[PDB]
Design a protein around this ligand. Sequence first.
Ligand SMILES: [Mg+2]
Ligand SMILES: [Mg+2]
Ligand SMILES: [Mg+2]
Ligand SMILES: [Mg+2]
Ligand SMILES: [Mg+2]
Ligand SMILES: [Mg+2]
Ligand SMILES: [Mg+2]
Ligand SMILES: [Mg+2]
Lengths: 65, 214, 149, 100, 61, 135, 141
Amino acid sequence: DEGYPAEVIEIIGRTGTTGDVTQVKVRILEGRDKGRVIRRNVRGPVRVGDILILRETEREAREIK
Amino acid sequence: AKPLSERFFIPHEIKVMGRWSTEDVEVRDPSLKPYINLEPRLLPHTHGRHAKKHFGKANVHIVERLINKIMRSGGSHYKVAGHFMRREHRSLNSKKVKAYEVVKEAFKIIEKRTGKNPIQVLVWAIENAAPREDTTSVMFGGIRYHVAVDISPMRRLDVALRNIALGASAKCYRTKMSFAEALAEEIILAANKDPKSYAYSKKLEIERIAESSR
Amino acid sequence: ATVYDVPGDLLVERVAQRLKEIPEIKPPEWAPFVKTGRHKERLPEQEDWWYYRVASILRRVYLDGPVGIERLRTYYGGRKNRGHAPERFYKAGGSIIRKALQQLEAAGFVEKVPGKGRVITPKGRSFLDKIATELKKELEEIIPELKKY
Amino acid sequence: QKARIKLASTNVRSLEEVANQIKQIAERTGVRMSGPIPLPTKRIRIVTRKSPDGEGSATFDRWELRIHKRLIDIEADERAMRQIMRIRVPEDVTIEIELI
Amino acid sequence: CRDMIVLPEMVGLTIYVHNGKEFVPVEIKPEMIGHYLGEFAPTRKRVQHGAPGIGATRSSM
Amino acid sequence: MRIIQTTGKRKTAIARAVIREGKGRVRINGKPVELVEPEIARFTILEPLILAGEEIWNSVDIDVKVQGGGFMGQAEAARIAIARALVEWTGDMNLKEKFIKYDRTMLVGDPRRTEPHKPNRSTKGPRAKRQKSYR
Amino acid sequence: DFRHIVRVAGVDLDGNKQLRWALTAIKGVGINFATMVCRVAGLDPFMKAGYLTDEQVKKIEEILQDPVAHGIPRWAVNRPKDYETGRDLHLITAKLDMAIREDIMRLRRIRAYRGIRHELGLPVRGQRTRSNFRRGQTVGV
RNA sequence: AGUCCCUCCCGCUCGGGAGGGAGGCACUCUGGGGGGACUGCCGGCGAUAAGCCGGAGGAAGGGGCGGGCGACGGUAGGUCAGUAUGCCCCGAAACCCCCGGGCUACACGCGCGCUACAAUGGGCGGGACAAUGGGUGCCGACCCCGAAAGGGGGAGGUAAUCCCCUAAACCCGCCCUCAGUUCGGAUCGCGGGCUGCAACUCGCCCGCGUGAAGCUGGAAUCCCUAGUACCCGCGCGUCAUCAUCGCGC
Ligand SMILES: [Mg+2]
Ligand SMILES: [Mg+2]
Ligand SMILES: [Mg+2]
Ligand SMILES: [Mg+2]
Ligand SMILES: [Mg+2]
Ligand SMILES: [Mg+2]
Ligand SMILES: [Mg+2]
Ligand SMILES: [Mg+2]
């Protein structure tokens, strides 16, 4: 109902139709799967050290080249 | 009308507009914590020296961000509440004095109506109006589809501020309400998660659409 | 205390109120029917605008003398709305300013420097500075920082 | 008892040469000379359409002509007055002498 | 002289004012005092429009 | 009898400031600084004085002559001149360090100027252009 | 005292408006002329129109009959140097309308250029007619 | 700016201001010469090269920022109606002058714009701060007359000296309170002026009166990355008079 914070640890690359989406690796900070590292797609400027609020932590983005 | 003590006001401490302190304001959201600048500062006017550098807007006081956000016309090339709002010559663009006065009066109204520190109410409003999930578009067979993605904190802050400004602009358009009153009303409504707030309803709709397309 | 120590508009208001006691200052007979310049649209709304204009002219002469009719005409001009055409700047008329200056001279507040314009006499300087001092004495009760000046 | 000299030219170097000659003439004698004062430069700017016809995108030329000026004051002494009266200026330098 | 001003002593006469290609007759009436002669000799013919031609609209080109 | 002169520039506005021992009176073109309007312009000038402290403020007198530019450009030049005069008069590096943290431009100035206009709708700006049509 | 409707010179005036703006309902009286007549009559232009008395209305109508005789300048009337009598007159309501109609009819009788332009319903003061002044329906090719 | 002298104001003068004369080149400015930034220093990636990414110090940091200069050619692109020029035509008219008309017409389609559809306002009184340019067939301060537009004299200026030249958006106080209105100002009537040899066709300005459509705009589609875009006025060109334009500030 409030989501789970995750911390960005690595930048992979740009993607999307018009280069608007970035793929990152994040580490869960709270919840059932705290400590796991998964990759995600993010819209907007982002840098290492930012914190995202995920609404669910079971979907993983498909790897890009 | 306005008393002489207010027309010629002399400050003596470094605090926002010489009237309010941000010592006890706290940001609950961990993600927006490093992007809401609350350092002590008297005059919120940095003369646009931050836009040059990447991530430069991070270290700009939040009140000046609001002032810049409302310094606009409002409805140029898309409709807000079903209307174009093209102010043109009568628009507030490039008049930072009038926007400063509007924000000051709105803060006075907010403090009078609730009895709390206005900066705290503003922080609560932007916290409640910032979405957490968005979508991006793909094209297949001549049809447009949505795919759910996540939002970075800085974009969340930008969207929250823009939606608050747009709601305030829409409330005072061709009605008897004034701009300052509309801004105060919008902030108060957004702080209480009231659906009558434009920003809160917009956030709810965005998150619903994002959820229905995972 | 001098004229430089007080806001202009408050001083103009006080001087306009005080000027009604001088017998030599009287609005002309065509005063109730005219506008204050070609760039205006409607007649003045105050029933005693003549005294306000005269006080403003006196304070203007105090600060920028010597000065003549044309530069004052430039000062009292403004922007005009021209229907379907873009707005433009225009000067004001001459009769009001000339009559006001002649009345002020008859009152002994200004004098004429040949080929240069009009300047403020010692009597007029004292008249303005006394009112300025009174206004500053009233004003600093609510703004304590003015006691230093 | 003082003479005022005005110089103007479109070439900076010739102006400097004439000024230096006057300065040396004043130095070789006991006579006080107020230094060469540089006055603001005259700029003549003319903007014209390029094409002879009216077809195509509109482009413009900006031609410019610059005129430099100097001012010198010196006290009227006949021993030095004759020397400066006999100096020969280049054809692109204008000189004017007056007594004040 | 299309720019001659009508005077009271001219009332009662008839004058032929050039209009570009011909002289048209004008009978001077008392109420014409103060007007130029050319006001009574029109130079253009009244317009009666025909059918729009090819190129008059976007689709007709 | 110390007298110190300083200069400030901001987009065609030029300010010259003179500082000496005094009682705390500051004048801008002869007007007391407490009467400057509008408020947003008044606070621009007052920030260096508030940062310095009340003890330093009440021990000096400052007179500023400023010309050129607009009502907002003139205030900033006066602010720059006052900051430089303050750091030079007291000559302590704690205050100089504090100014740089709060606002660097107080001491280094602002080099921005307008960009000259270009053809194709010259009167509007160097980059704004006429609307383009195809039919 | 207060009356919500006051009739002056055959026109009903609002009683809740200021007198200077209430008087503008009369055809032939603008805001400036109304202020002039209010000042000549010795009445505050900002008073409510509903506080007028009968004598004041009579005085106002009398002033409206012959303004020049009551101190209004000759250059402020709407018909100076009348074409028939040669005097300076001010007209309102029907008389104004029939005076304008008579002027246009006089222009038409002598077959002057402006008379023809009035007859044909075309611009009179020298405007261009190729682009603007279009009032009709599109014709097809 | 500091220093000296004289005169005048204020809380009566301890103190605080404004002019004028001496005097000075400090500060601003003007314009000649010179210095300063080089991937030079530090840490990574790449190859240990070429380079790239990130920091210190600095007025300025990675073509420092904005302009001028457009290769061999093509486009049978535009211009013989700027001037130069071959051929063909007219050569007592298709050459040269003068008078009056037209290029300004008006069921209609289209381009670029200005003014608005109001409170992020309209009106009235008062208070603030520029730059670029131009002036002898000319710019004209200062005085007088007039309600305004304008009129009669006229210092100084061939100009860092005199003049155009005390910008508007902005701020303070009062009236109007969501209405086709105190929004909008098209159209038309009467009257007064300027330039010019001449103002009807066919000029520009002022006073009073009158008061049209318009209540935010479908499908479509344009400009812009920092002192940039938006908003606000000003200067020059054209020019006897006339700017909703061009080039600049
Ligand atoms: Mg004004
Ligand atoms: Mg307008
Ligand atoms: Mg610009
Ligand atoms: Mg071809
Ligand atoms: Mg044509
Ligand atoms: Mg209106
Ligand atoms: Mg005509
Ligand atoms: Mg409406």
